[PDB]
RNA sequence: GUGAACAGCCUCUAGUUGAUAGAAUAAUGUAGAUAAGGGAAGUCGGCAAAAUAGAUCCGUAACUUCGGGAUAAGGAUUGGC
RNA sequence: GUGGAUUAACGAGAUUCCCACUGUCCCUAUCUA
RNA sequence: GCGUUGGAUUGUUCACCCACUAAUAGGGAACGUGAGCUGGGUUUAGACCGUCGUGAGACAGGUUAGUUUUACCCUACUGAUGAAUGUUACCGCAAUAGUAAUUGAACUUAGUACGAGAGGAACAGUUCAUUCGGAUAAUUGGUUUUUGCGGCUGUCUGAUCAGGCAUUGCCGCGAAGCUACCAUCCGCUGGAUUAUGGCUGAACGCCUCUAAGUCAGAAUCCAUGCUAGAACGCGGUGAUUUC
């Protein structure tokens, strides 16, 4: 029993789901699901959809390249079988996958970092044109004020 | 009955009825093999006849060596092209329909098979698996 | 889907993928193996005038001139490009043998690469040569 | 004369499952029952003590 | 060939439930009245907790029951209305 | 003239009138035969179907071809909160049948029981067995008079269980009641259980366990007024026919000069009742197991209900039957769970099932991820996260 | 306006908004549609539907009353800037 | 007993095959008014 | 009890061929089903050829083209309600009627028994499939007025934006619902017998399965099980008014 990878769409592949195309040359593509598979079908190019790992990767939304990414690989020569090492390994797949979160969201929030200049610049432009609109908001709390105070005053 | 075929053969989508073209996929010198009869078929009024992947057929060849043309012989499906199901889940499909010329006893005309081979038509057939060099 | 898709994209009527026709054109062996076809009856034009590239067969010889001018033979020369995306961009973009997939791009940048462009080059100015001083009627005649 | 209407729930007060809601028909026998009323209070009758005691309906041409 | 009425069969089927199946069959229904032991068990100590934090031959005439009671009482329709089996 | 080209018959000619239910409860009406050494046992039990779901097993069956390999099976999942005892009937062998002569209920019965006994429980003034509490009274003995007599007479118990139906997503408010048999034995240590247990409950891990064939006693989903050619499986009569094509065309001859009760007409398609038999149980899951849905190759902490709930249904919280295949009636239910009527000597019957993995993915959609972490995990950081 | 076009499709001036209505969404119809794998195995009979289709360029057989057949057959294309 | 015998083009005329194409069919399902 | 096919072909059918198959048995029901539906006839009028007739015309000689068009009624059948037996509610019994599963392979027995050889079984123990039936929708496929999201052409709203119209404009994906050997699951065991094989034993001083009595034995019969529940068959149990 193996998890597999979506060939168009990059995303984990559980056992009866989705399907399976065998090539002539005996390479098997697996599908995601339908809308991956039928993109597949009519020729359309992952690195161009926008929703696939394989565009946010070459893009540069997400980090591509990292340490923690060189630990899942496909193991051709295997060992014999020992209860410590499979608890060793058990424990480091935990210890991986929280430095590897961590290091996403670092990447996430360096890519992100002008968004609170941009806004204000925007914000701060927007003001300073329209200064009429603005005598119609001061016009518009005094009498919010007066009004409510005495109906308060009542 | 059955003959050449070891053990039994679980249930396979059906695929090609009595009245389609498939290609040949050895070397005995056909090109496509045209469909007339399905060994081990059941009876029912209007129902065609269908083969699916691994199934005993009787065929008669149309493109080819113009030896081999104008006689019916036993033919072996080995890709099927309809999407089927794996017991470990998964369903699958080929690119085309294919078989291969053999004799009533299970043996291959032939000498090597072309292209990949289902593993359930090489596990039910012993000759095949010996001619194949691509299993799925 | 609809009617159009299912009438064009059908499994019956299936086209040649992008990275056969990547290893095609590279390994100039191929390439002269790719053009010098024998004779088939089943072929457009007894299986001679193939396009490696748009892997169709063509008619007569001016009909491989007016394609090769065309602008659907420039789109399909621009998608055989660069890293033909195989199953290892899919594994590496889950981030699963991340470092084989590293070696197949420094190696088809190294040396793959270079070799395709001038296999493709080569065959452009052998195609450029021949095509030029063709009839456009042809002889039957399959020698 | 009921023969194929349509069932429904509001039968079941009376013991019948076809029933209907002849709107035309309950205008004009309220208009009579009106004029009924008004004729036994200018004669005057306890309006409270009052019940239906004969009613007909009979072709015209 | 054979159908499902078939007396081989049937004496073959036989001889197979009297042996392994039927002993199967023992060990699950013990282990089954067990487990239903431990349930009302561990029910009447839950309600023992509650508990312990607040604080001769029975012969037959007659039954009780409404609509008993009411067929009692009345005990005469049937014979009046010239009906009722056994009786003229 | 004979018909010149034989065909079976469409349709099933044991499984007439088909025509609707009396009662959303399928009544049982078989039991297994008492045995009068065995201890004292339930037959059968009652739940609500919630949706289905898809197992890995790793297979153990000598001979076949699947020997041990990996097989993908759908099971369908059944959601048993204990039940509870509430009375007791005694049923004598008359040369006519059986004959129900005595009932004795508990002394504290429940709100949900009352709504089974009333049609407007919003008005009234709930005073169902409100002279019968009386009966316990210090003495009473009407209640110790009933009981002898059934110790007495009364060759069959049956004992009266209600479900827990606040403990389900289910808007109903309104519990089921149903007989069920006792087969032990000894007819006064079976009324002498049944007092004991008074207002009490019962779980399903005291009726039944793993690796047991049961039988699923449900009424089918509904489909209304339906046409001969779904209603019966007839052939389509070829295009642009006059008066129609998804008809029968020849429905009888000149003789008899009548439409014969056999010859396939349009009416009512669901809604019966139906026992289906040999159904093995793949798990018997608790409710406060917290991994419950989770294997000795999985390794991950989740329960067995899906990512957003089942369709139509919501969360499990309570313990659960887990069987292999399809059981009849759709999703929320009321199906009856009895145990098996005969010994069966197939070895299908007496193998052990080792489950791999359970799916927990989403069935609104195409769900694709097993836990909201393992969701969270492929996406990584959103623009509402940050 | 599009377009070869008094074709079809959308709009200005002018004119109309008439034709018993309300609520639901069973079967069977009438008028339309889509369908995996196969491709006439269906039927008296490829009935009906699908497929083709404008324009540019290349190319086009038997036969012939030499005028035709002929848009024979077959192929490469078509946007925006 | 030496109107008869051919005939390009044209035809809502009659008959038979091939390629393409398909819900005609295997074997039915679903949707709109 | 249960099955008995797919095609080809002469006007059509039988017969006859080609396969597959466990097998491709034979008949009846107005030569079942000419106002359930259809090709051809009954069934005319137009036209041509052959033969006959002086002629009008004829021919069941040949070839073409050719108008019947209920159901809303009663019953039958399929489903759906329902007054009345103090009222109202819940849990049951089962008279009667129906009934359902069917064929073929595979391992092992065993290269054994049997046989010069060539060849070559079966009972007990296990595993799959064909036809039929009842469900079901986790997954795969189909379907889309979710007009859910996106795009395309023409025109209109001054442009952007947001949209209208194009008889559901068109194209791609598409949940939910429905659905498919185009998907998945499930489909029992007791008694009495038939043909036969026997035991004891007369008729008939022998003998005999029969005469009295009796032991077994078919996919058979009746049950078990499964569907309905007599709306004029029944039982048990709860609560019984406020003017
Ligand atoms: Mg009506
Ligand atoms: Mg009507
Ligand atoms: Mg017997
Ligand atoms: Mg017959
Ligand atoms: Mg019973
Ligand atoms: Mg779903
Ligand atoms: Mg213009
Ligand atoms: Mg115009
Ligand atoms: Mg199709
Ligand atoms: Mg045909
Ligand atoms: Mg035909
Ligand atoms: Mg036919
Ligand atoms: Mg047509
Ligand atoms: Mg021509
Ligand atoms: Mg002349
Ligand atoms: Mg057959
Ligand atoms: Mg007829
Ligand atoms: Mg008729
Ligand atoms: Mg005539
Ligand atoms: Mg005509
Ligand atoms: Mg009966
Ligand atoms: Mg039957
Ligand atoms: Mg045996
Ligand atoms: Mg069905
Ligand atoms: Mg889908
Ligand atoms: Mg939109
Ligand atoms: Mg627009
Ligand atoms: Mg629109
Ligand atoms: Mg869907
Ligand atoms: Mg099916
Ligand atoms: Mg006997
Ligand atoms: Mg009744």
């Given at each position: 029993m ?36 039928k993109?597949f ?19 540069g939304?997400?980090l ?29 797949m ?42 119609i ?11 409510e105070?005495?109906?308060?005053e009542? | ?13 059906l ?34 006849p ?33 999407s ?21 006893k ?6 090597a ?17 010996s001619?194949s060099?691509?299993?799925? | ?19 056969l ?10 390439v002269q ?10 072929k ?26 065309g ?27 991340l ?16 070799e ?17 001083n ?5 002889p039957?005649?399959?020698? | ?23 035309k ?28 005691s ?8 | ?10 004496n ?28 009302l ?7 023992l ?30 014979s ?9 | 003239?004979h ?11 044991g ?17 297994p ?5 065995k ?119 049956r ?43 019962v779980?399903?891990?005291s ?8 039988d ?34 020849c ?57 957003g ?10 313990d ?42 989403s ?12 969701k969270?995990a ?9």
């Open positions: 193996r998890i597999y990878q979506c060939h168009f769409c990059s995303s984990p592949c559980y056992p009866g789901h989705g399907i399976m195309f065998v090539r002539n040359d005996a390479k098997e593509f697996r599908f995601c699901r339908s809308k991956c598979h993109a079908k009519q020729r359309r190019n992952p690195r161009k959809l926008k929703w696939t790992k394989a565009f946010r990767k070459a893009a939304k997400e591509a390249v990292d340490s923690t990414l060189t630990f899942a690989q496909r193991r051709n020569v295997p060992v014999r079988y020992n209860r410590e090492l499979v608890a060793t390994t058990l424990k480091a935990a210890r991986i996958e929280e430095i590897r979160q961590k290091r996403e969201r670092a990447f996430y929030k360096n890519r992100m970092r002008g968004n609170k200049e941009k806004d204000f610049l925007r914000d701060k432009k927007l003001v300073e044109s329209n200064p009429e609109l603005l005598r908001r001061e016009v518009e709390i005094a009498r919010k004020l007066a009004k105070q005495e109906r308060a009542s | 009955s059955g003959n050449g075929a070891q053990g039994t053969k679980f249930r396979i989508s695929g090609l009825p009595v009245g389609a073209i498939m290609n040949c996929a050895d070397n005995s010198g056909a090109r496509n093999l045209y469909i007339i009869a399905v060994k081990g078929s059941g009876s029912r009024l209007n129902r065609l269908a083969a699916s992947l691994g199934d005993m057929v009787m065929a008669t060849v149309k493109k080819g060596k113009p030896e081999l043309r104008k006689k019916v012989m036993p033919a072996i499906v080995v890709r099927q092209a309809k089927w199901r794996r017991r470990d889940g998964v369903f699958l499909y080929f690119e085309d329909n294919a078989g291969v010329i053999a004799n009533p299970g043996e291959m005309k032939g000498s098979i072309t292209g990949p081979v289902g593993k359930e038509c090489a596990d039910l057939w012993p000759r095949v698996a001619n060099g691509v299993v799925v | 889907m609809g009617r159009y898709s299912v009438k064009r994209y059908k499994t019956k009527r299936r086209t040649r993928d992008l990275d026709i990547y290893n095609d054109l590279s390994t100039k062996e191929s193996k790719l053009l010098n076809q024998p004779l088939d009856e089943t457009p034009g007894l299986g001679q005038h193939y396009c490696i590239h748009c892997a169709k067969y063509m008619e007569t010889a001016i009909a491989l001139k007016t394609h090769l001018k602008k659907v033979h420039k789109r399909r020369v621009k998608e055989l490009r660069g890293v033909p995306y195989t199953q290892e961009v899919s594994d590496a973009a889950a981030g699963y043998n470092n084989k997939f590293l070696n197949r791009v420094q190696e088809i940048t190294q040396s793959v690469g270079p395709k462009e001038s296999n493709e080059a080569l065959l452009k100015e052998h195609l450029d040569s021949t095509l030029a063709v009839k456009t009627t042809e039957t005649l399959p020698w | 004369f009921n023969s194929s209407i349509g069932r429904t729930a509001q039968g079941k007060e009376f013991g019948v499952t076809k029933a209907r809601w002849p709107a028909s309950v205008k004009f026998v309220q208009g009579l029952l009106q004029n009924a009323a008004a004729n036994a209070e200018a004669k005057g009758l306890d309006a409270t003590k009052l019940y239906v004969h009613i007909q309906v009979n072709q015209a041409p | 060939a054979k159908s499902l009425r078939a007396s081989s069969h049937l073959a089927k036989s001889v197979k439930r009297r042996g392994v199946f039927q002993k199967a069959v023992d060990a699950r229904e013990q282990r089954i009245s067990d487990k239903l032991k431990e349930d068990l561990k029910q009447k100590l839950e309600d907790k509650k508990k312990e934090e607040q604080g001769k031959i029975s012969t037959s005439g007659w039954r009780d029951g409404r609509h008993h009671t009411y067929k009692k009482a009345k005990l005469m329709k049937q009046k209305k010239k009906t009722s089996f056994t009786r003229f | 003239s018909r010149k080209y034989e065909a079976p018959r469409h349709g099933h000619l499984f007439l009138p088909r025509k609707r239910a009396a009662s959303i409860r399928a009544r049982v009406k078989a039991f035969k008492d045995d009068r050494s201890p004292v046992a339930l037959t059968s039990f009652l739940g609500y179907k919630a949706g289905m779901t898809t197992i890995v097993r790793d297979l153990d069956r000598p001979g076949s071809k699947f020997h041990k390999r990996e097989v993908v099976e759908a099971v369908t999942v059944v959601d048993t909160p204990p039940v509870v005892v509430v009375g007791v009937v005694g049923y004598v062998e008359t040369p006519r049948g059986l004959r129900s002569l005595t009932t004795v209920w508990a002394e504290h019965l429940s709100d949900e029981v009352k709504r089974r006994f009333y049609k407007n429980w919003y008005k009234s003034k709930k005073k169902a067995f409100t002279k019968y509490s009386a009966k316990y009274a210090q003495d009473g003995a009407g209640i110790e008079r009933e009981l002898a007599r059934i110790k007495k007479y009364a060759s069959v118990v004992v009266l269980v209600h479900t827990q139906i606040r403990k389900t997503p289910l808007a109903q408010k309104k519990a089921h009641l149903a007989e069920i048999q006792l087969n032990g034995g000894s007819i006064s240590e079976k009324v002498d259980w049944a007092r004991e247990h008074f207002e009490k409950t779980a399903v891990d009726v039944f366990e793993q690796n047991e064939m049961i699923a006693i449900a009424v089918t989903k509904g489909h209304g007024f339906e046409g001969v050619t779904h209603r019966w499986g007839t052939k389509k009569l070829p295009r642009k026919t006059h008066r129609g094509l998804r008809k029968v065309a429905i009888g001859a000149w003789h008899p000069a009548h439409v014969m009760w056999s010859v396939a007409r349009a009416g009512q398609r669901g809604y019966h009742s139906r026992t289906s038999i040999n159904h093995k149980i793949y798990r018997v899951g608790k409710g406060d197991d917290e991994a419950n849905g989770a294997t000795s190759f999985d390794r991950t902490k989740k329960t067995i209900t899906p990512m709930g089942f369709v139509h249904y919501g969360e499990i919280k309570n659960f039957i887990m069987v292999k295949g399809c059981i009849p009636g759709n999703r929320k239910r009321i199906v009856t769970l009895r145990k098996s009527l005969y010994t069966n000597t197939s070895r299908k019957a007496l193998e052990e099932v080792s489950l791999k993995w359970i799916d927990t993915a069935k609104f959609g195409k769900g694709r991820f097993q836990t909201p972490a393992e969270h492929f996406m990584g950081t959103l623009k509402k996260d940050l």
